[PDB]
């Protein structure tokens, strides 16, 4: 299987990338350096992760060392919810570029479909704990994203955590100039996303699977939640293939024509997670993994559920 997938902007995107949410700032520079040394060419970033400066130090050092050329890297970041306004989008993108020490992003995503009140706080709340919305809509935010392409700041634009109706809304936007290249969504054997993936793929939108290992380090994990990495059924498939459970969990979305972005700051795991291009899951393995769906989400947040554009009320 090829290492890159063709996007609807004509560029190629590496199907395996390194995730950086929760990567501590004192560890992420080495994580990214190691990743690039062992073959990663795609890094998934976001302003809200609060570590773009440190990710950027690694990228810049590897470019300066001539380990890789800029054209060989595929750097992704995301517009946070408090920057959905027309007059804030460019500055948000530019802050990310400055922190990452780049002159362009390969892909810039609307991080969530919901706009929040601008200000210092990433999750502005009212006194009862509800997020404070902005009156921005996804269509006007999309137009602002299109301007970034036309100004040379980003090569591609896309969306993240958009449900099927929201993807459709973008595709049906009056005067749409650029289709979204990517929809980045949670996807793993407990949340298999067959409906949304089929819709996006049918429209030429590439899907990126986040939390492919079930995000065991998510800060709201409870001791009782289901655990992909410990699931004996998945362990059995891994054992049959002489691979680790994580390697199976990474190969799974690859064979569905998805991009996948496992996170690690452990050098041995960063390397392990990349060694997924030399084995194949059978069709029966794939269907078996799909069968584990339980509609379980890592990524959801009660405080945001009443926002008009909160994505997880719809079935898909
Ligand atoms: N667009 C969005 O809204 C959104 C939401 C969530 C995530 N994402 C992106 O997707 C990335 C991945 O998702 P995620 O960070 O939620 O979780 P994940 O990649 O599913 O899991 C990361 C966890 O798995 C551990 N791990 C990694 N490789 C392992 C291996 N080979 N064996 C055992 N454990 C392993 C990591 O530990 P160590 O790091 O300690 O090694 C870490 O605790 C994020 O970092 C972010 O870039 C985007
Ligand atoms: O959004 C991500 O990429 C990962 O999740 C996070 C990352 C940070 Cl750095 C802070 C908070 C979250 C989080 O709470 N995510 C769940 C979440 C769900 C719906 C909405 I609208 C907003 C957030």
Swiss-Prot record:
Q: Which residues form the active site?
A: 49
A GO CC term assigned to this protein in UniProt? nucleoplasm
Q: Which UniProt keywords apply?
A: Acetylation, Cytoplasm, Lipid metabolism, NADP, Oxidoreductase, Phosphoprotein
Q: Which PROSITE patterns match?
A: ALDOKETO_REDUCTASE_1, ALDOKETO_REDUCTASE_2, ALDOKETO_REDUCTASE_3
Q: Which SUPFAM superfamilies match?
A: NAD(P)-linked oxidoreductase
The EC number(s) attached to this protein equal 1.1.1.21, 1.1.1.300, 1.1.1.372, 1.1.1.54
Q: Which family does it belong to?
A: Belongs to the aldo/keto reductase family.
Q: What is this protein called?
A: Aldo-keto reductase family 1 member B1
Q: Which organism is it from?
A: Homo sapiens
């Amino acid at each position: 299987m090829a290492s890159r997938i063709l996007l609807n902007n004509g560029a190629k995107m590496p199907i395996l990338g390194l995730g950086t949410w929760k990567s501590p700032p004192g560890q992420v520079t080495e994580a990214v350096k190691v990743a690039i040394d062992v073959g990663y060419r795609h890094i998934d970033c976001a302003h809200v992760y609060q570590n773009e400066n440190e990710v950027g130090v690694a990228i810049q050092e590897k470019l300066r060392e001539q380990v890789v050329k800029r054209e060989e890297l595929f750097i992704v970041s995301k517009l946070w919810c408090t920057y959905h306004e027309k007059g804030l989008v460019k500055g948000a993108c530019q802050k990310t570029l400055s922190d990452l020490k780049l002159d362009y992003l390969d892909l810039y995503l609307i991080h969530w479909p919901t706009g929040f009140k601008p200000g210092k706080e990433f999750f502005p709340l009212d006194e009862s704990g509800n997020v404070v919305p902005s009156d921005t809509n996804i269509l006007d935010t999309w137009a602002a994203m299109e301007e970034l392409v036309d100004e040379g700041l980003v090569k591609a634009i896309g969306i993240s955590n958009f449900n099927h109706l929201q993807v459709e809304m973008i595709l049906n936007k009056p005067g749409l100039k650029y289709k979204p290249a990517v929809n980045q969504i949670e996807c793993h054997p407990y949340l298999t996303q067959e409906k949304l993936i089929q819709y996006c793929q049918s429209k030429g939108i590439v899907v990126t699977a986040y939390s492919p290992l079930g995000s065991p380090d998510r800060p709201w994990a409870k001791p009782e939640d289901p655990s992909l990495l410990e699931d004996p059924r998945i362990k059995a498939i891994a054992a049959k293939h002489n691979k680790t459970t994580a390697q199976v969990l990474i190969r799974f979305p690859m064979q569905r024509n998805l991009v996948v972005i496992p996170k690690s700051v452990t050098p041995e795991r960063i390397a392990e997670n990349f060694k997924v291009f030399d084995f194949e899951l059978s069709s029966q393995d794939m269907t078996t993994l799909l069968s584990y769906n339980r509609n379980w989400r890592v990524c959801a947040l009660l405080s945001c559920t009443s926002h008009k554009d909160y994505p997880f009320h719809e079935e898909f």
